[PDB]
Each structure stands twice: as C-alpha cells, then as structure tokens.
Amino acid sequence: EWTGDNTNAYYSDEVISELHVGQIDTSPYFCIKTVKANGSGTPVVACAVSKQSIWAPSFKELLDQARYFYSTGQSVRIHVQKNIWTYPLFVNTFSANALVGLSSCSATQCFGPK
Amino acid sequence: EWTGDNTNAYYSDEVISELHVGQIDTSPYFCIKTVKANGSGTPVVACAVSKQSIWAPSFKELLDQARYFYSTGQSVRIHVQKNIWTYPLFVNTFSANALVGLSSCSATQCFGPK
Amino acid sequence: EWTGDNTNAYYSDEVISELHVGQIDTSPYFCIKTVKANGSGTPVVACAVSKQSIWAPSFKELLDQARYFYSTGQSVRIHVQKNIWTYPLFVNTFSANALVGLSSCSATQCFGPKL
Amino acid sequence: EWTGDNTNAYYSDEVISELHVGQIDTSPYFCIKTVKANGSGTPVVACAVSKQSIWAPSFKELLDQARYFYSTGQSVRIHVQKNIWTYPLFVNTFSANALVGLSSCSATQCFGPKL
Amino acid sequence: EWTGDNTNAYYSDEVISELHVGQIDTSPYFCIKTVKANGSGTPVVACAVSKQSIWAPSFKELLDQARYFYSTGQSVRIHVQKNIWTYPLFVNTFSANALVGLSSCSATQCFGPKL
Ligand SMILES: CC(=O)N[C@H]1[C@H]([C@H](O)[C@H](O)CO)O[C@@](O[C@H]2[C@@H](O)[C@@H](CO)O[C@@H](O[C@H]3[C@H](O)[C@@H](O)[C@@H](O)O[C@@H]3CO)[C@@H]2O)(C(=O)O)C[C@@H]1O
Ligand SMILES: CC(=O)N[C@H]1[C@H]([C@H](O)[C@H](O)CO)O[C@@](O[C@@H]2[C@@H](O)[C@H](O)O[C@H](CO)[C@@H]2O)(C(=O)O)C[C@@H]1O
Ligand SMILES: CC(=O)N[C@H]1[C@H]([C@H](O)[C@H](O)CO)O[C@@](O)(C(=O)O)C[C@@H]1O
Ligand SMILES: CC(=O)N[C@H]1[C@H]([C@H](O)[C@H](O)CO)O[C@@](O)(C(=O)O)C[C@@H]1O
C-alpha cells in the first residue's frame, strides 16, 4: 500500500481549517476538516485512527504533520482513502475517509503524488 | 467507548484558561480549566492521567492537543466523562472528570460530536 | 503519592528563569530556577531525575512543561518535595528539591493544589 | 556506514522548500524538496522511510530536523545516499535518494562532512 | 558519572551557532558547534550518539535542549567529556567530545556545575 496509490483520492490547494482529537475503541484518533484556499468547493473531512486500518502505522506522523499545517494555515494537498471507517455515528459526525497523506503546495503545484 | 458517546458531556465555545501538570499514584497527569470564550457561565475542569482509566491510550495525544489549544487561546469544545477519578483530595482540588476529546470551534460550529 | 500532598511544598507567582539538562548515575535529569515575578524573595531551585525518587515517572511531562513555561515567561506555581537529592556537589550546585508539579497562575490565584 | 561517507552525496546552501508525509509498505515516510538558495541548479528530493534501509534508525530525528529547517527556511547542507528506494511509482513521484543527514550552514561553510 | 564531574570540561558564556544531525553505525547522532557569545576564543564542537557511551540515555533530552538553545541564540554553558568518539573521519569532521550537559546562562553565573 502507498499514499499515492491511484485507488486513493486527493484534494489540492486545501487549508486545514479544523482539528479534533479523541478516542474510540481503545484507540486514539484525530480528524481534520479542510477547505479550498480559494473558497470554492465543499469541505473535505478525514480521520486517522491509531490502531485501525492499514494506515495505522503512520498515525503519529500524520497527526504531527496535520497539527503543523493547521497551525500555519498553508495550502496543502490532502490524500485520503474513501469508505474506511464504519461506525455509523462516527462516520456521520466526521466521514468514512481515512487520512493517508499530507503534501505542501506552492501556487501552481503540490509536492506529492497526483 | 467513544469520545462522542452520548453518556459523555461536552462544553462548546470554551477557551483553555489554565494548565497543570503533576503526578499521582505513579502516573504523570494534567488538568485543564476552561471558560466560555465570551466570559459567561461556570468554568470546567478536566484531567487526564497516564496509564489510568479506559482513556489512558489517548493521554499523550490529549496532552499535546491541550497544550496547543492552551497556547493559542482559541475557542474549542471540551469533551469529558464524569465521575472517573476517585482519589478524594485530587477530586476536591480538580475534579473527577476525565478529559476524552478536544475540538476546534468556529463562530458557527464546533468540529466534533454533539 | 500526589503532587498536592501536604508533605510537599509550593511557591506561587514564580517565573522559570533558568534551565539545565544533564545526566547523573545513568539518569537524565533537569533542573530549573524560578524567581518571583515581582523580583522579591529568594530563588527556588528544583530538579527532576528520570530514574530516581518516587517522582521518576513524570520526568518527561514536567521537562516539557518546564520548557514551555520557561519559553513564555508566564507566572506559575512550582511544586516540590524538599530534601530528596543527596549527592552533595549536585545539591550545592542546584538543590535537594525534587520537582513534582507546575501550575499556571492568574493574577489572583493558581490552578493547582494548595493547603 | 556514516552520513559523511564519501560514497554518499551532499548539496550545500539549499533551502527545504516542500515537505510531504505519507505511508508505504507498512512504513510512515517523509520526503523533502530542496532548492539552491542562489536559485541555480535543479531541486534535490530525498525521503526517509521508517524501518526501511540502513538509515531506518534515524527516521524520527531526521523528520524532526527537516521540519525545523523547513519552518525557518534557512540554508542547509542536505546529505543523501543515492539509489536506495526502489518502489518505481514512489521513485517517479519523489526520488530514490535516502535522506541521511542535515547540516546548518553559515554563509561561508556548512557544519557537516564534506569531501 | 555526572555532567558536573571535575573530569569533564565546560565552557561558559557560549552560544550554539550550528547544528547537524546524521547517523553513524546504525545510531542517530547530532553535533553542535558553540562559540563565545562575545566572539573571543575558539569554537567548541561536541556530539551525542544515541546508542553509544554512558551518556546515551540523555540523547533525546540533549538534542531537544540543543535545538531550543540553537533556536533562541541565548547564552549557555556547554559541558563535554573529552576523547570519547573514535571513528577518525567523524572526529576530524566534528570532534571526540561527547556532549554531556547544557546550562542556561542569563544570570551572573550559568545555571549548572562549574568544578
Ligand atoms: C576546558 C576548560 O578549560 N574550561 C574552562 C573555561 C575555558 O577555559 C574557557 O571558557 C575557554 O575560553 O573557562 C571557564 O572559566 C571562565 C568563566 O569563569 C568566565 C565567566 O563565566 O570567565 C572567564 O575568564 C574571563 C572573564 O570572563 C573576564 O576576566 C574576561 O575579561 O577574561 C577572562 C579570561 O579571558 C573564565 O575563563 C569557563 O567557565 O568557561 C572555566 C572552565 O573550567
Ligand atoms: C514552603 C512555603 O511556605 N510556601 C508558601 C509560599 C512561600 O512562603 C512564599 O512563596 C515564599 O516566597 O507562600 C505561599 O503563599 C503566598 C503568600 O505567602 C503570599 O503573601 O502571597 C502569595 C500570592 O499567591 C501566596 O499566596 C505561596 O507561594 O503560594 C504559600 C506557600 O505554602
Ligand atoms: C453538560 C452540558 O450541559 N452540555 C451542554 C452544554 C452545557 O450546558 C453548556 O455548554 C455549559 O457550558 O451546552 C451545549 O450547548 C454546549 O456547550 O455545546 C450543549 C451541551 O450538550
Ligand atoms: C553530488 C555532488 O556532486 N555534490 C556536490 C555539489 C553539487 O555538485 C551541487 O551542489 C549541485 O547543485 O556541489 C558542492 O559544491 C556542494 O553543494 O557542496 C559539492 C558537492 O559534493
């Protein structure tokens, strides 16, 4: 598995606008909401869960990276895998999107798979 | 268990106004005090204790996130489970509330379970 | 044991003004000096030692918290247990105070135990 | 092995201009892009992958340091070993370079190994 | 052993002017260069090697503290043990000094041992 796999999805030129931390079923998790830097489109929501999904090993790295980009407000590309989380209330609160990567973006391009 | 379980309680549009770090019964712990962003109402006090309670796995994540939100002074939703800590002197000084989640808040909504 | 036990001591309206990190007898340790925000009184010195004393488990959390408060210069309450460290050259350089807690302070009170 | 082995490669007076974090084959990894402070030449790309390659042990330290230099935008020397990552899509997106060290630089020299 | 042992060496009123991180023999390491704040004298170079020497336990604490003081440019006392590292090219690039402590130095005397 890889962040950049074409079965994952990404959204470019987003700003991380919200951050949530919690626990579910013995596992720390976090979620972020992102919106286009230019005001267009719909918000993206994705979560990472420390002990769940193939993406579990990168939990701490993604959490720290999300916090950094959140604190700066800079434009980023968010990589997700759709339809992972399954607890209905959790999905309805956030989304079924697993967060699988974060890339910095300049004006015209982002540094990461596309 | 989940941060968002309806048997937990939460308080929106709060600011983390104080932070304390200590140790109890072999465990580092931290407690926070939060107040309404607008200055109304009654302060909320919650603690997290390393290697104690079902919420233990999230101790470091919550500590890190509390320190961040404390340093920014931004509006947040605090999520707690009541009646967890039983050490009487500790409860008298702080409270029996376990901290179980933290969510950033815009002016219109908080990013988390409700 | 608890930070807030009446057998510990505390000092309010202090500011962390120095920080030292080192190692002794295979254990990382750090020490801080605090002084009254208003310049009065006598400095307080306390150290935490990673593998020693009943307070060992909170070493990392207190080091990080000390670093934070040292960086902001904000007024805090420092909690110690007296007469813990015993190596004479160490005590004479620093003190025998074990660091057992740190609380943020407001104008009129601090957020932490007090008798 | 060592960061400063002559079989490694280094690039001086670079600025870390982009940062990516992701996961591959069970391992979190990060990559950085660096560009000459003077605007010349071609960007250098290097990645570190947790628990992969002989450089695995230094993953966290390099991530932390890359984040630091990325945030300041100061000029550094980036040290890499070429031809380490072999996953073709990953290499195409980023490069085969393993990140093996970072050195700060003054205007006249960098603090790290050099031929 | 202790940072403050009289068999160690220390240098007061220094600042951390450079920082390098890398790996050697499967161990993360970092080195710092310090110079007198006032510009007199000659630089001191010291390194900490994560898996190596009696000082190994303090590696993360020293690296974290080194980063902090490097970022602020504030005065410090650096404590070292001489003639520890032995890999020749490494020693020639950096030094044989192991970093064994860091003390803040705002006050009249630095906050740390000075035997
Ligand atoms: C390994 C070693 O010798 N360490 C000693 C150091 C070094 O010799 C010195 O740092 C290298 O230049 O010197 C130490 O003592 C110095 C210290 O007490 C400082 C004040 O913190 O004073 C220095 O003398 C200065 C003094 O500040 C003024 O009189 C100035 O005008 O000149 C003199 C000498 O130039 C001391 O050398 C140290 O702590 O750095 C003691 C170490 O053991
Ligand atoms: C070990 C001890 O007695 N600690 C006292 C502390 C010290 O006596 C004092 O800080 C020495 O400088 O004093 C404490 O109470 C303080 C009052 O004495 C002071 O007049 O006002 C302070 C306002 O916060 C404070 O209330 C303290 O520092 O909290 C009490 C403590 O036990
Ligand atoms: C235990 C409890 O009462 N929770 C409720 C709180 C509190 O009444 C006030 O927030 C007190 O600050 O009010 C809410 O509107 C909120 O803050 O989001 C809904 C929430 O369910
Ligand atoms: C692989 C390689 O040749 N690295 C060399 C680089 C590059 O040629 C240029 O940096 C490319 O832009 O140049 C140096 O002067 C430098 O940066 O310190 C010496 C270094 O050995």
Q: Which residues contact A70 (CB under 8 A, 6 or more apart)?
A: A16, A19, A32
The two tokens of residue B104 are: 């950033």
Q: What is the DSSP letter of A68?
A: H
Q: Which residues contact A41 (CB under 8 A, 6 or more apart)?
A: A35
- In this complex, is the C-beta atom of E50 within 8 Å of any C-beta atom belonging to chain C? no
CB C20 within 8 A of CB C38: no
Give the bridge partners for C10, in sequence order: C79
CB D45 within 8 A of CB D9: no
Relative to the CA of D13, which ligand 4 atom is closest? Answer: 17
Tell me the C-alpha to C-alpha distance, in Å, between residue A93 and each of A7, A59, A96, B104, E66: 24, 20, 10, 14, 42
Q: Which residues contact D39 (CB under 8 A, 6 or more apart)?
A: none
Phi, psi of A9 (to 5 degrees): -130, 150
Q: Report d(CA B53, CA B96) in Å as an integer.
A: 11
Cα dihedral sign, C61-C65-C68-C70: negative
D12 lines ligand 4 (CB under 6 A): yes
Q: Report d(CA A111, CA B13) in Å as an integer.
A: 35
Nearest to D109 by CA among D14, D17, D8, D13: D13
What is the radius of gyration, based on Cα positions, of chain A?
A: 13
Q: Report d(CA D80, CA D100) in Å as an integer.
A: 5
A103 to chain D: closest CA residue: D20
> What is the number of CB-based contacts under 8 A between chain A and chain D?
72
B63 to chain C: closest CA residue: C61
Hey, of C10, C81, C104, C115, which one would you mutate to test binding to chain B, going by the most B CBs within 10 A of its CB? C104
Relative to the CA of B13, which ligand 3 atom is closest? Answer: 17
B partners (3+ CB pairs within 8 A) are A, C
Q: Report d(CA D103, CA E45) in Å as an integer.
A: 14
HEC readout, E25-94:
CCEEEEEEEEEECCCCCCCEEEEEECCCCCCHHHHHHHHHHHHHHHHHCCCEEEEEECCCCCCHHHHHHC
Q: Report d(CA C62, CA C53) in Å as an integer.
A: 14
- In this complex, is the C-beta atom of E28 within 8 Å of any C-beta atom belonging to chain D? yes
What domain count does chain D have?
A: 1
Q: Quick check: helix, strand or coil at residue D3?
A: coil
Domain of residue C19, residue span: 1-115
B12 lines ligand 3 (CB under 6 A): yes
User: What distance in angstroms lies between residue C17's CA and the mean position of ligand 1's atoms?
Assistant: 23
Chain B closest CA to A85's CA: distance in Å? 14
What was the structure determination method? X-ray
D41 lines ligand 4 (CB under 6 A): yes
**CA angle, corner E14, sides to E10 and E20, nearest 5?**
90
Q: Report d(CA C20, CA B28) in Å as an integer.
A: 21
Q: Report d(CA A70, CA B72) in Å as an integer.
A: 12
Phi, psi of A104 (to 5 degrees): -70, 150
Count of Cβ atoms closer than 10 Å to residue D43 Cβ:
15
Q: Quick check: helix, strand or coil at residue D72?
A: helix
Chain C closest CA to B28's CA: distance in Å? 5
Chain D closest CA to A113's CA: distance in Å? 6
Cα dihedral sign, C41-C42-C48-C54: negative
The two tokens of residue C98 are: 């074990």
**Cα separation of the two ends of chain C:** 16
> Letter for the amino acid at E37?
A
Instruction: Report chain E residues whose CB lies below 8 A from the CB of D3.
Output: 22-24
HEC readout, B21-50:
EEEECCEEEEEEEEEECCCCCCCEEEEEEC
Q: What is the DSSP letter of D97?
A: P
Chain C closest CA to B74's CA: distance in Å? 17
Q: Among all ligands shown, which has an atom nearest to the Cα of B12?
A: 3
**Cα separation of the two ends of chain B:** 15
- Please judge whether B28 and C2 are an interchain contact, meaning their C-beta atoms are less than 8 angstroms apart: no
Q: Report d(CA B47, CA B84) in Å as an integer.
A: 10
User: What distance in angstroms lies between residue B83's CA and the mean position of ligand 3's atoms?
Assistant: 17
CATH of the domain at B99: 2.40.50.110
Q: Report d(CA E107, CA C10) in Å as an integer.
A: 23
Give the bridge partners for A15, in sequence order: A35
Q: Report d(CA D29, CA B104) in Å as an integer.
A: 27
C100 to chain B: closest CA residue: B22
Ramachandran bin of D85, using left for φ above 0, alpha for ψ from -120 to 50, beta for the remaining angles: beta
Chain E closest CA to C24's CA: distance in Å? 4
The two tokens of residue B31 are: 């407690």
Q: What is the DSSP letter of D88?
A: H
Count of Cβ atoms closer than 10 Å to residue D73 Cβ:
11
Q: Report d(CA D60, CA D46) in Å as an integer.
A: 15
User: What distance in angstroms lies between residue E83's CA and the mean position of ligand 1's atoms?
Assistant: 21
Nearest to B101 by CA among B44, B24, B25: B44
Residues in chain A: 114
Q: Report d(CA C31, CA A19) in Å as an integer.
A: 34
DSSP string, chain C: -BTT-TTSEEEEEEEEEEEEEEEETTEEEEEEEEEETTS-S--EEEEEETTSSTTGGGHHHHHHHHHHHHHHT--EEEEEESS----HHHHHHS-SPEEEEEEEB-SS-BSS---
Cα torsion through B3, B5, B11, B12, rounded to 10: 80
C49 to chain E: closest CA residue: E58
Which among E68, E106, E115 has the least Cβ separation from residue C17?
E106
B9 lines ligand 3 (CB under 6 A): yes
HEC readout, A6-35:
CCCEEEEEEEEEEEEEEEECCEEEEEEEEE
Q: Report d(CA D98, CA D79) in Å as an integer.
A: 9
Q: Which residues contact B93 (CB under 8 A, 6 or more apart)?
A: C4, C112, C113
CB D15 within 8 A of CB D90: no
Q: Report d(CA D7, CA E22) in Å as an integer.
A: 15
Q: What is the DSSP letter of B91?
A: H
- In this complex, is the C-beta atom of E28 within 8 Å of any C-beta atom belonging to chain C? no
Cα dihedral sign, A58-A63-A68-A74: positive
Helix axes A59-72, D59-72, angle to 10 degrees: 10
Interface list for B 94-113 with C (CB within 8 A): none
